[PDB]
Design a protein around this ligand. Structure first.
Ligand SMILES: O=P(O)(O)OC[C@H]1O[C@](O)(COP(=O)(O)O)[C@@H](O)[C@@H]1O
Ligand SMILES: O=P(O)(O)OC[C@H]1O[C@](O)(COP(=O)(O)O)[C@@H](O)[C@@H]1O
Ligand SMILES: O=P(O)(O)OC[C@H]1O[C@](O)(COP(=O)(O)O)[C@@H](O)[C@@H]1O
Ligand SMILES: O=P(O)(O)OC[C@H]1O[C@](O)(COP(=O)(O)O)[C@@H](O)[C@@H]1O
Ligand SMILES: O=C([O-])C(=O)[O-]
Ligand SMILES: [K+]
Ligand SMILES: [Mg+2]
Ligand SMILES: [Mg+2]
Lengths: 516, 452, 515, 476
């Protein structure tokens, strides 16, 4: 059970040899699940089923839609979320994330229609213009795109990709205009994304349009921002600046999607609250055979720094049209969890696909299977050897509680936290047991989904005047949540982390107590 | 640096991940074998030439469909395309032929709680070949059609057999008896496709020459969320036993219709190589899809990238600690050669072998450097593709009357092959493995020599 | 350069060795217990006071010699010296008293009617061994009497017989016993005889041991070192003899012969701790094999969490000289590196000329060796080899030790009644000292058997409010640590308490700033 | 149940300790070298024959006392004893001669209870200059301590003595060693790399093949150890003087540090002084002394040394035999699984094919449990490169160079064998002849038998520097 026989192996190779398909996993699923909301999932009715299937974060993509449309999406999520608040013991917080548009390049309209398409045949000629006279009159001869300075960055012989890198063009002759030949062709539609691998796209990291959406998210009380195409640390500083004082508590997740962002990852990770490995654009900007290097590198460096990392894009792509995934997609999710990803994401599988609930359920089943097969003995040993010595009492308390949880096979680590930080410090050491973080801050409970293993619970009872009684109140609530979810039963042992006084920064007490 | 050598010198696996560098270029050699299913999209002589140039090592023919005259024509075109490069033996690549049996599949014969899936797992319990997740084995291991197909393979001189739906050791022995004495040198690769094969894997592996993780049927017979567990389990035990293991099915499925893979497909190929798979396989991507060459090229590029990212310092240590002591001189010589190749950053290990066994025992310990196996046996050269890192070369030169001179001829042939393929150049250091007398079984000599 | 912390952070043991630095000073705290045999050279109140100040934790009484009156006076002098520091509880050091039994010894008679006469034995010469009581006081270079009446039943021709702690060796030539001297030398009175490889059938607990153990219960000793333990049933016999009145006395089994090493696992299971008694052991087995048996027993005791003592000839040359040999400096250091909880002195303190110097040398070596321990490897291995458990105290103990490495704490403070909670911390071998606060004087004395436990005896009365009684004992430990230089105000320490009074309820670990 | 094989398979160091067995007998091969100081107790030819039969590999000559004529007769007696066994080349053991220099010494019975002039208890004479504490007579008296002071040595710890690296007497003694054809020099009180160079310069062209072992005996040599190690052929941990110059409770740190860095560099390290000191007067050692010898071997020392135990004491043969018995037990107790892995990890990757042949040979020897590794070598270098990786099996180094066979004793596990056959015309036949010679030596001394598997290292042409061939070969 829980691959515990493989966990006691002395080598990683023998650990693999002991992986048993008949060793059922524990109940808790530690990996967070982010879901992109769109036409197939934005109804209050479907959203309620997204939550029951395991969605923790509803993602809103501001590459498309108006502020009024997204405001309605946010309302439906919160409506579906609060529809379960009648039972505070089974209530699951749900976070809202805003994915900025960023320096996107998009084509124009095919023959004045949003749905029209033309067939590009390989080897044929195709002209690219910036003259807005063709902005709505693109066809197989001429194509308009919205990057005015595309000629200052594209040398002759360059390659241009259109529509998620499916169409590829080679610039055969530069103009004032661009004369290209189609390498790989096919159906060319309207408003398609363009990638220029190996070109210094001078488009601003934070456009005037992005400024409005960021301030929109601050007004809407979003829990986090996914910032697209972050190339350097100063790009992160603009995002932090625009969010200003009122958006101080909004977590900033930098998306790495090009060569420069990979090269500058350290300065970007230092300034950010988290990372997203956005493999979609990344797979086009750099060779597709190198993406897995960038992913393992970014996940490991984030695990080392104790900052959240998200694995995103095309994880269960085939499930947009089919109710079951391919074998490659099953192993991709599992290996991302084995790599150490805090969260796994879904895009078109939930935004527009035909089986959005099956996708969420499949991600939940695989992640719980992958979490049991993790070789904890080596991971915990390596995280401690790579983590520096600390003078923070909470840090020493966190590593001691994780070590104690491996020793007594505890059902959970219960943590009282106001800002989340205490639970974050436990999570970075990757215990096997789920981390039940008890909080009264709703925003804290929603941002805890970015961390592996943190199962946030929001206590709704009023603050008791006697502080030692307020602590016991929240601890017993955690015991009720854990017993109701089947994390443990009466008589089991659990780790409880508390402070010596109210307020953030005083977590310093670890207790080993039986389940009431 | 190159070949992820900065990540290679890390003291922990986590720090090894942190040092992976997309700007660190891999070496020229690609160690993982590429098995391509040949079908209507790829059975022309002109196409097969491009597939070989793209890196195809093994042509798989799926006997679930097609007549013997059809398959015999496919085999013939495969050998025409293969032998079209024989005029230059420095650059000639052996290409193997594999026969994949139909096996005991239920289609919509019969002699049949709940649970019963149909049409590749498209109905049960509802939904839009037939599988019985967790059921008895009514049909025989080797039916009468399989016997004729297996006998046809011996006649067409195939190098290996992929036996479908192996459930126990006696299934393997049944196949072996059918190949008989005329096909006793044909390698039997047991395909693990159901819960029974996973439960009885150790007895199946012991009876087999190798294993295929056939994830297609496996993902229907057992929960889909468990396939990664059984895959890593079987690759691990095959690595421990030193037997070849193939990862198969839906690795680049979307490339049937599209010229570039998804992100999940790109990481699936890489992680299979990182797991330790000797070979990776393409099915519909090469048999029926619109982009057969691109799929072969993509497996080549990913595999070479992932091989540079292997954490050899942990893998080599753990492979030795788990391997038993030996009295076989070839086994001791082989592990000494691999240790020496790491010590001097060798450009290759050159192995002279008649049956391939000497090269197989080197591949067992997973050197970073390519293993140039020099043989005069054509079947040995073709069967070498089943093993990670073995780059076979077929020596066509006549035997020299002085045995020491004949050894030097074959060694110098491997040197010219290595130079022409960019594995190494003049002045580099290589490991050379030979014996003290002619004949198989006497490999016991390791020499550390500069490339002339 | 401090605490060999540069060597502490190595990735291999070889690199750890390469980084050991003679210019990197150790900390104040010395973790290895020091046991001293008290004798003529050291039994005065004046000398005992200086030995306590020099670092002695345990006074060993060797009941192979002396009367009950003699030992009663020694014990009185030990307690006089100890309690002379009892007026400052912050600085008072508990001192344990250990009784070392005679056990099934074999001794010779008197040389020419004198307990101080001595003859000379020559190589190849013949020596007659008799059991006739007419010679028990009439021994000389021709006839030797010994008190083992069954010796002819257990020896044969060619057997080796060793006399006076292995100095002289004989070989039986005829069966009274006719022998030929192999190695000669001066033969005194009442010397010990070893019969290596013979099946000696003496009782585990003799009538003399019965009287000495009863004396031990009346005199309130803290532990018994039981000589020549051969099997678990020997340990049980000692436990039954001590009975109800001696149930709290710790029983340390001395492993000194071949059967003891062979049956070590069952003996360890029955005992509270182990002494590697290398003196007799090096005569009973080949001396080139002693180091193997020592490292085996220390390893298995560390694995089981039970105290192990390394004993005998650690600083033998300091009996006559003020400074040890290089081999002796190495032996003490390697015993601490092996994992020994305590190191022992015998003749160096019982009868030598430099008893204070010997105690001070062991203190200096042990503290240097403790800094050199490769804690990264040791802590990882003790955890891997320890089973998962449902005991909250064990999980709390391993979390506290892990926390102490994380924040480089100056100490782990533990409140314990019986000692058990501190013993469970010591089993995981933290670098930081373990300050065990107890109100039980016997718990305080017995804690010296465990590496790193620094016991302090709280004298303050019990507070009615239990949370105040707890805070009182924690602050007392804070004052002890500051007064002894383990830490200072602003540092971080680990505190271990329980949720309710009484033994067995330790479940609370706190990371606390030093006020 | 043999050679601590059960403990050898443990997955942790702790479990390795827990599995050590006193009932697990070692092999016959003893890998650690034994160096004996020759003096009035061991000077006679008949005594030296027994010391050789008991395990002495190197005879040490202490040039702090005695005359050139005295030491010359000592050398003649050693060579007389050594060559008395030469009638059988199969069983002959080479014996090396080492010269130990006096070096920068400061020397002076009355009583003293708690006035230096540069012979009574009121004014003492010393031969030195200016410059705190001063130690006299093996550090027993401190200046403050007391004792029976009676031409005793003086130590000035921490200080910087103005005495030259080599003295006029040492120059004469070094030139004497050159004339007497000694195999190695133990250079006393080496403080810096320049001191090693001045010694190497004194030995000149005629003494260029003489191995220089630097003795580390004070604080400065410990701090400048890396530069001294690089310039030297090897290191001696001279714990006698070192234990006076630095606090005695720190000697074990310096010893373990210097053995580790020598093992890491692949250079010989000798642990010396007071290892069996009580055996000067007693036929058996103390428990601390048996532990000290064994822990020196477990630390990784290539050689162990006897001083007064063989030079002046009553039981020299017993002392040599005890070091032999302890060393053999401790070598079986080595945790090879960890040691070999760590040695490889800290060793650099190079292009020298001899080094790559050496690791591959050691790895192969662990895989097939070989009875030996046979190395053909003319300078010793190829055998030294095998020994740095510490195989469990013995290294039979077959040479025709008699100085090489004697110098090989400085390296753990190298069993030197001197071939005296004429050089055969065919190269391949001259190699086969020397290999077969090692097979016979192995069978004679019980290292292996017919049908066993051994590792054989050879090269591709005559002369030194060409070892590149490893073979796994059945014993004939
Ligand atoms: O993780 P954070 O943000 O530091 O908060 C943890 C805090 O929660 C507590 O357990 C309770 O604090 P509050 O009563 O103010 O909510 C404190 O003891 C502790 O300092
Ligand atoms: O791997 P195999 O089949 O054992 O072959 C190894 C043999 O090949 C050899 O190169 C000799 O082969 P040949 O008999 O063709 O000359 C020897 O080195 C060795 O004994
Ligand atoms: O180590 P022991 O013998 O279990 O004693 C530890 C006990 O001491 C306590 O801290 C309290 O001690 P008191 O009973 O003297 O107040 C308990 O919480 C705990 O169970
Ligand atoms: O260890 P060294 O000094 O390099 O000598 C090893 C030499 O021994 C040999 O095996 C034999 O050389 P020789 O003919 O000089 O004895 C050479 O191949 C090799 O170069
Ligand atoms: O047969 C296969 O290859 C499969 O089912 O995966
Ligand atoms: K006694
Ligand atoms: Mg993008
Ligand atoms: Mg000296």
């Amino acid at each position: 059970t829980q691959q515990l026989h493989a966990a006691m192996a002395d080598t990683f190779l023998e650990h693999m040899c002991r992986l048993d398909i008949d060793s059922p996993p524990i109940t808790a699923r530690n990996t967070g699940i982010i879901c992109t909301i769109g036409p197939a999932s934005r109804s209050v009715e479907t959203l309620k089923e997204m939550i029951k299937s395991g969605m923790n974060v509803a993602r809103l993509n501001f590459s498309h839609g108006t502020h009024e449309y997204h405001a309605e999406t946010i309302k439906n999520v919160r409506t579906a979320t609060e529809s379960f608040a009648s039972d505070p013991i089974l209530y699951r917080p749900v976070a809202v994330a805003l994915d900025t548009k960023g320096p996107e390049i998009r084509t124009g309209l095919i023959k004045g229609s949003g749905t029209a398409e033309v067939e590009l045949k390989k080897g044929a000629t195709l002209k690219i213009t910036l003259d807005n006279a063709y902005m709505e009159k693109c066809d197989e001869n001429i194509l308009w795109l919205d990057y005015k300075n595309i000629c200052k960055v594209v040398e002759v012989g360059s390659k241009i990709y259109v529509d998620d890198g499916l169409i590829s063009l080679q610039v055969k002759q530069k103009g004032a205009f661009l004369v290209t030949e189609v390498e790989n062709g096919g159906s060319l539609g309207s408003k398609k994304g363009v990638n220029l691998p190996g070109a210094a796209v001078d488009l601003p990291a934070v456009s005037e349009k992005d400024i409005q959406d960021l301030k929109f998210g601050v007004e809407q009380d979003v829990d986090m921002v996914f910032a697209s195409f972050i190339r350097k640390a100063s790009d992160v500083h603009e995002v932090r600046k625009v969010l200003g004082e009122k958006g101080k508590n909004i977590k900033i997740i930098s998306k790495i999607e090009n060569h420069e962002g990979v090269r500058r990852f350290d300065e970007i990770l230092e300034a950010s609250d988290g990372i997203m490995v956005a493999r979609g654009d990344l797979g086009i900007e750099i060779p597709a055979e190198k993406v897995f290097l960038a992913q393992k590198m970014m996940i490991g460096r984030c695990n080392r720094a104790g900052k959240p990392v998200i694995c995103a894009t095309q994880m269960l792509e085939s499930m947009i049209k089919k109710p079951r995934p391919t074998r490659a997609e099953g192993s991709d999710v599992a290996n991302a969890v084995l790599d150490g990803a805090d969260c796994i994401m879904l895009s078109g599988e939930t935004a527009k696909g035909d089986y959005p609930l099956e996708a969420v359920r499949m991600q939940h089943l695989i992640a719980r299977e992958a979490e049991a097969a993790i070789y904890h003995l080596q991971l915990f040993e390596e995280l401690r050897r790579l983590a520096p010595i600390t003078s923070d009492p909470t840090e020493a308390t966190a590593v001691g509680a994780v070590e104690a949880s491996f020793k007594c096979c505890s059902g959970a680590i219960i943590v009282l936290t106001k800002s989340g930080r205490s639970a974050h410090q436990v999570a970075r050491y990757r215990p096997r047991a789920p981390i039940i973080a008890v909080t009264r801050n709703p925003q804290t409970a929603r941002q805890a989904h970015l961390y592996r293993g943190i199962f946030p619970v929001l206590c709704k009872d009023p603050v008791q005047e006697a502080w030692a009684e307020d602590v016991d109140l929240r601890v017993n609530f955690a015991m009720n949540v854990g017993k109701a979810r089947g994390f443990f039963k009466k008589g089991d042992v659990v780790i409880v982390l508390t402070g010596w006084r109210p307020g953030s920064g005083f977590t310093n007490t670890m207790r080993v107590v039986p389940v009431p």
